[PDB]
C-alpha cells in the first residue's frame, strides 16, 4: 500500500529522511527544467506543514493521498475556464483556445494542444462545451 516511499528515496539523496530545497533543485536539474530559487521555495511551501521549511515523509504521503476529483477543485477549474468566455453561455471558439494555450501562461507544445483538442469539439463546429471538458479531468 505504502509504496510511495520508493519514490521518496529518489528525492532523498542524502538519506536524512527529509527533502530539502537543494535536493529538489538538484534532482530537477537532471530533467533539464532549470528552475528558479523563488520558484523552488514556493513549490516547497505547498507541502510543508511543520513550518520548518523542510518536507517530512508523513506530509509526503499526506500530499500524495489528496484526491483531485472534488467540488473545491472542479469549481475552480470551471471558474478559470469561465474567465475566458466572451459571453458566459458556456462556449469557446477553438482558434481562441489554441491561441491562448499556445501563447499565454506557460506555453504548451503544439502536439499537446492537438491531442487535447481532438478529445473535444466532437459536438460539431468550433464550439467547445467546457462544462463537459471539466468532468473528463
Amino acid at each position: 500500500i505504502a509504496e510511495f516511499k520508493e519514490a521518496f528515496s529518489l528525492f532523498d539523496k542524502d538519506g536524512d529522511g527529509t527533502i530539502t530545497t537543494k535536493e529538489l533543485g538538484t534532482v530537477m536539474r537532471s530533467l533539464g527544467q532549470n528552475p528558479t530559487e523563488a520558484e523552488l521555495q514556493d513549490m516547497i511551501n505547498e507541502v510543508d506543514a511543520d513550518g520548518n521549511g523542510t518536507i517530512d515523509f508523513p506530509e509526503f504521503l499526506t500530499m500524495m493521498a489528496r484526491k483531485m476529483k472534488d467540488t473545491d477543485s472542479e469549481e475552480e477549474i470551471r471558474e478559470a475556464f469561465r474567465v475566458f468566455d466572451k459571453d458566459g453561455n458556456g462556449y469557446i471558439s477553438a482558434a481562441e483556445l489554441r491561441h491562448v494555450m499556445t501563447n499565454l501562461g506557460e506555453k504548451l507544445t503544439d502536439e499537446e494542444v492537438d491531442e487535447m483538442i481532438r478529445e473535444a469539439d466532437i459536438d460539431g463546429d468550433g464550439q467547445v462545451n467546457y462544462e463537459e471538458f471539466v468532468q473528463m479531468m
Binding site: 520508493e6 519514490a7 529518489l10 528525492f11 534532482v27 530537477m28 537532471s30 530533467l31 533539464g32 527544467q33 530559487e37 523563488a38 521555495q41 514556493d42 513549490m43 505547498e46 507541502v47 500530499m63 500524495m64 483531485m68 477543485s73 475552480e76 477549474i77 478559470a80 475556464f81 474567465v83 475566458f84 459571453d87 453561455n89 458556456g90 462556449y91 491562448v100 494555450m101 499565454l104 501562461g105 506557460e106 504548451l108 507544445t109 502536439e111 499537446e112 492537438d114 491531442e115 487535447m116 462545451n129 462544462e131 473528463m136 479531468m137
Partner: protein, 339 residues
Amino acid sequence: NIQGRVYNFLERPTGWKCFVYHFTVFLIVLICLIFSVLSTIQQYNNLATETLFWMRIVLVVFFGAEYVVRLWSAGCRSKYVGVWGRLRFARKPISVIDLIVVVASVIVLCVAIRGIEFLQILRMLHVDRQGGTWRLLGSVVFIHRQELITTLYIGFLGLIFSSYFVYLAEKDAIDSSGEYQFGSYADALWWGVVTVTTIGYGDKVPQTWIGKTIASCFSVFAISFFALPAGILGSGFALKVQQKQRQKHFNRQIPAAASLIQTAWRCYAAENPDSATWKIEHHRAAIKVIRRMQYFVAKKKFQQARKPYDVRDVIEQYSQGHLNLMVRIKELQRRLDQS
C-alpha cells in the same frame, strides 16, 4: 445569434429598452386592480363586465405567451440545452411563480377567490430576475450568523423574564372602566412584545407603581438588544462597499487562469503513457510528483489572483525580492573571492 439576443432581452436586462416593457406591464396590471375595484363598486354594469373580461383574457394570454417564449429562449446556455436538461431550468424557484400566476389567472377566468385575484400581483412584485438582490443579502446575513443569533436569544430571554414579573405584579389591578387588562400571562406577553419593539399602542399600560418600576428598568436595557441587528447589517454592508472599490484589475487574472488549466490538463495527461506530453522508468514517477506540486502551486496562485489587495502580499513580496537579491549578492561575493 437572434436567440441569444432574445434571451438577453427577456432575462439579463440591459436598460431602457426592456425597462419600458417592464413599466408597461407594471402599470397595466395596476390598472387591472383598479378596474376590478371599480367593478366591485358596481359602476355601469355592461362596461365593468365586458371590458374587465376582455382585459383579463388579454393579460392571461400575454402572460402565457411570455412564459412559453422565455422557456424556449432559455436554451442559449449549455446548462439548459436539450429536452431533458430544460426541466432543470423549469425547476428554478423563480420560474415556478410565473406558472403559479398563470394557472391562478386561468382558474379565476374560468370562474377566498376575492383574495386570489390579489395573488396574481405575485409576478409583478418579483421583478428582479437575475436574483442579484437576494444573492447580495444572503451572503451578508450568512457571514454574521453568530452575533445575530446571540442577540436575538438574549432579547427573547429578557422579554420572557421581564413579562412574567409584570404579570405577577399586575394580576389583580382593575382599570378605570372596570376591566382587568392584565388578567392572564397571555396579556402580559402581548404587552411585552408591543413594548420591547418601541411600538406602544397604549391599549395596555401598567398601573401599579411596582409594575411601572419593572417596566422602566426593563425597557431601557432591552430595547438595544433588539435595535442591534439593524446596525450590525448596516455596518456590514458599508464595510463591503469599501472592499468593492479596491479590487484588482481584470488584467492580472488571465496568466494565472491559463496556467491553472494548463497544469491541470498536464496532470491529467500524465496518466496516459503514450500521450505526447512525455516529450517534455523511474523518472516517469518523479515527473508525476513534480506536476502535482506545480498544479497545487498554480491553484494557490489563482486563488490569490482574484482577491483585494492585502498587506500579506507586501510581506511575501518583500521576502521574495530579498531572497532574489541575496542569492546574487552571495554569488558575486563568491566569484570575487576566487582571487
